[PDB]
Curated annotation (Swiss-Prot):
Dual specificity kinase acting on both serine/threonine and tyrosine-containing substrates. Phosphorylates serine- and arginine-rich (SR) proteins of the spliceosomal complex and may be a constituent of a network of regulatory mechanisms that enable SR proteins to control RNA splicing. Phosphorylates: SRSF1, SRSF3 and PTPN1. Regulates the alternative splicing of tissue factor (F3) pre-mRNA in endothelial cells. GO terms for biological process: regulation of RNA splicing. This is Dual specificity protein kinase CLK1. Its main location: nucleus. Interacts with PPIG and UBL5. The gene is CLK1. It is found in: Nucleus.
Length: 333
């Protein structure tokens, strides 16, 4: 399929733009003429072994969540319809704006303002708690999978970076991409999450469930506050070293129980802090509170919540039901 602007799918959907393209296929914006001209997003997924399972799985999850919550009141993306189409699976969603990643990137990796982080954090927690209440774990939370509802924006010239800068009119979000979401009673893949957002119990192959999402959210929130990913590595041992730099030592029981022995020596990470890699980690990462940009109470409150989300032991990690009551959110209520 070429999906030029102007092409039509299933009579009702007129393509107006391609929003993005990947190896899986593409995401297009369409006018849905059947529904009165509403614009929608259509994920057009190649119906081949490499991509089909995630498409079919997302469709099942979202059909369930749509039955449970037909008006989409918990900040989860609303799938409107799905269909078979000439060797592709097309999944039609409400149209959303750019991802939170996209926004930060287009703004030169400047971080979000704390007031917007508070609102976005609450909405992410509310959405994922809804999944947790329904025996689901998302497993792939990251900024790319949190989309702004609207991209409309105001623009001031910012003299400190010597250019115009956009501020969103509305920081409301939806959580997207339910292709990895897993029910409690379903097969759990050994490896889940995008590497930078992956919980320690996943890395150590200790078993995972809902708490691994809370770890990912902690990772997201600190990235919103700083503008950069806090664990920038593809190496598991280095990732654990970065964790230890930011958060202190791993709990001994987790190190003792893991079968991933290659990471450890005498039940400590097998890591030379003064090697070239160790020197890099020491400069790339710092103890969590040193990342704070202010000592204002509200910054302290955010960092308290982040620390609770980045608890190593998933049995001790804050739940999203508890997170929604955290004092950081008082200013919203
Ligand atoms: C269907 N959609 C989740 C699909 C899976 N997923 C997370 C991606 O494919 C990520 O990449 C894009 C998502 C996207 C639009 C464009 C994307 O392409 C990027 C753009 C930035 O430059 C890199 C390539 N989604 C959406 N946009 C607008 N409205 C939407 N409604 C629902 C979705 C969506 C979710
Ligand atoms: Na508050």
């Amino acid at each position: 399929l070429i999906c030029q602007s102007g092409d039509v799918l299933s009579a009702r959907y007129e393509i107006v733009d391609t929003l993005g393209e990947g190896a899986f296929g593409k995401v297009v914006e369409c006018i849905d003429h059947k529904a009165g001209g509403r614009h929608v997003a259509v994920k057009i997924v190649k119906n081949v072994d490499r991509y089909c399972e995630a498409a079919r799985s997302e469709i099942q999850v979202l059909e369930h969540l749509n039955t449970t919550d037909p008006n989409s009141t918990f900040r989860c993306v609303q799938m409107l319809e799905w269909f078979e189409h000439h060797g592709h699976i097309c999944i039609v969603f409400e149209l959303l704006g750019l991802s939170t990643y996209d926004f930060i990137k287009e703004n030169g990796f400047l971080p979000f303002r704390l007031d917007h982080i508070r609102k976005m954090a609450y909405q992410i927690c509310k959405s994922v708690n809804f999944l947790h209440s329904n025996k689901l774990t998302h497993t792939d939370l990251k900024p790319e999978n949190i989309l702004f509802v609207q991209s409309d924006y105001t623009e001031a010239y910012n003299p400190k970076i010597k250019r115009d800068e956009r501020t969103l009119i509305n920081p409301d979000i939806k959580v997207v991409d339910f292709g990895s979401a897993t029910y409690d009673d379903e097969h759990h893949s050994t490896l889940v999450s995008t590497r930078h957002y992956r919980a320690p119990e996943v890395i150590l192959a200790l078993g995972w469930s809902q708490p691994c999402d809370v770890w990912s959210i902690g990772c997201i929130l600190i990235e919103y506050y700083l503008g950069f990913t806090v664990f920038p590595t593809h190496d598991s041992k280095e990732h654990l070293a970065m964790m230890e730099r930011i958060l202190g030592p791993l709990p001994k029981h987790m190190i003792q129980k893991t079968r991933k022995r290659k990471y450890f020596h005498h039940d400590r990470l097998d890591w030379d802090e003064h090697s070239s890699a160790g020197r890099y980690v020491s400069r790339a990462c710092k103890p969590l509170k040193e990342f704070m940009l202010s000592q204002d109470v509200e910054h302290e409150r955010l960092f308290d919540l982040i620390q609770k989300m980045l608890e190593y032991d998933p049995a001790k990690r804050i739940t999203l039901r508890e997170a929604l009551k955290h004092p950081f959110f008082d200013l919203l209520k």
